[PDB]
Amino acid sequence: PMILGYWNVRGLSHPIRLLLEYTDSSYEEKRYAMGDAPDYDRSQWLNEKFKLGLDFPNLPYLIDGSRKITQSNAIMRYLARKHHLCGETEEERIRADIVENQVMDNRMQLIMLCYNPDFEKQKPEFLKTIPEKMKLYSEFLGKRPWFAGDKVTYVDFLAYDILDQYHIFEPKCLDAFPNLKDFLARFEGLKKISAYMKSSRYLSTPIFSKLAQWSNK
Amino acid sequence: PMILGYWNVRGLSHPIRLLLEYTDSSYEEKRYAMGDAPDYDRSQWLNEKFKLGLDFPNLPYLIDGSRKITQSNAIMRYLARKHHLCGETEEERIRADIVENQVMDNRMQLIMLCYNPDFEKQKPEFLKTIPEKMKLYSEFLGKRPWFAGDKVTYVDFLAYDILDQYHIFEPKCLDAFPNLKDFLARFEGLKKISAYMKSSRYLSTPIFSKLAQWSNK
Ligand SMILES: N[C@@H](CCC(=O)N[C@@H](CS[C@@H]1c2ccccc2-c2ccccc2[C@H]1O)C(=O)NCC(=O)O)C(=O)O
Numbered sequence A, B: 001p002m003i004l005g006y007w008n009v010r011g012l013s014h015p016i017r018l019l020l021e022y023t024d025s026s027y028e029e030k031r032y033a034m035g036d037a038p039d040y041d042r043s044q045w046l047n048e049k050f051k052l053g054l055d056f057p058n059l060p061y062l063i064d065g066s067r068k069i070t071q072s073n074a075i076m077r078y079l080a081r082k083h084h085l086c087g088e089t090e091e092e093r094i095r096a097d098i099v100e101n102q103v104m105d106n107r108m109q110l111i112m113l114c115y116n117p118d119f120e121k122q123k124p125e126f127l128k129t130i131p132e133k134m135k136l137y138s139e140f141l142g143k144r145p146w147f148a149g150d151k152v153t154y155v156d157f158l159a160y161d162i163l164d165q166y167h168i169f170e171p172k173c174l175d176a177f178p179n180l181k182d183f184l185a186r187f188e189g190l191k192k193i194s195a196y197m198k199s200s201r202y203l204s205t206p207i208f209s210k211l212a213q214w215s216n217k
């Protein structure tokens, strides 16, 4: 079957794990362990980083038969082409392209806070930027069932993940945006997703490595 | 015409500027001025950031009639689709997807150094990581004229830009990689490219905004 390599955290791999499940993919994972500090040992990964035939070794990586891919969004796009989960029209394509890039920014923003040694001090100000971020997703989605428009697409998995992560971070952040709350429930209600969420494979936390200041365990 | 909006620096907009040129796109630009330190005033942008109908306001932005796009890779992909500069096969699409994301990472690493107050002290270690990055690119391209294969695609624009930046940063960095040196010289050689580089519109440097420790003017 296919192999997905990543750390044994949620990190940025949740959309891939969820899409492998939604597509009924035949896969197994390598969940690399990282030692405790000070070292935060990575040998488990580093012993084999350059022995996998990856063009640009990284985590996550996906091996599918002959094919070897890195870069979470490239993996996501490969799986979407594979299972016909791309935007179909130019309009859907541009909406998807924008969402894909926008989620990664909002993800980088959260990461930058969560790896800041001055976390608690920076938090209040980070929390203040949430309503603005959420408002932009809320308005973009509007009354659409999915981000692209009519059909679930791979960007719905990206959006689910980052919305959920912000929701975990600040539990009241969706209260003013019922459509986003509805979107999370609609996503979570997709048959294979609901079954996966209750399964032994599910990893909702920790989101970050032991290194982080938040969701590090 | 289309309108491209971005700061009055190269930043991450280079590939876009270059693709508009290559596609003989009819466009006008809005190059937003940023104040000097210690304030680095952003009022020229900030005055109309929320007045342009962008779903997720940002720089760069591209307006093409009713269509409004943000996210530099979504801009690139819109233009790519419009001019048939995407991968044509599954193999080409995967190569282009990985390159796209890989450039952004190599770009984010350069920014991470170049905005660090400890830039000078951090430089030794950064320089040490350079050969590894260049080797990956070199090996990936291999004998192909272009990153996706036999034909130019939009990812040649992204790769050209980051390789050039690295090269500007560390001049001797491509000495070992004739293929990289050759790819730069090949890209710069494209008619529309050669012309643009000599035009009134070209802005090679500064690479970064005034807030940076390097290529900030
Ligand atoms: N843009 C690429 C980025 C690939 C990349 O940086 N990989 C990380 C793991 S991802 C990392 C992480 C490591 C542990 C815990 C959490 C994260 C994480 C979470 C959210 C978002 C970014 C991150 C990141 O902090 C890694 O450990 N790489 C193998 C190595 O360097 O040898 C992508 O989209 O795939």
Ligand SMILES: N[C@@H](CCC(=O)N[C@@H](CS[C@@H]1c2ccccc2-c2ccccc2[C@H]1O)C(=O)NCC(=O)O)C(=O)O
Residues within 6 Å of the ligand: A101, A105, B007, B009, B010, B011, B012, B045, B049, B057, B058, B059, B060, B070, B071, B072, B073, B107, B108, B111, B207, B208, B209
């Ligand atoms: N993923 C998104 C990234 C959009 C984004 O962050 N935009 C920056 C300008 S781009 C910024 C930058 C600003 C000035 C000069 C250089 C850059 C730059 C250069 C290399 C790499 C990243 C950067 C970035 O640090 C900006 O000023 N935004 C409007 C604002 O906040 O009101 C994209 O790919 O398009």
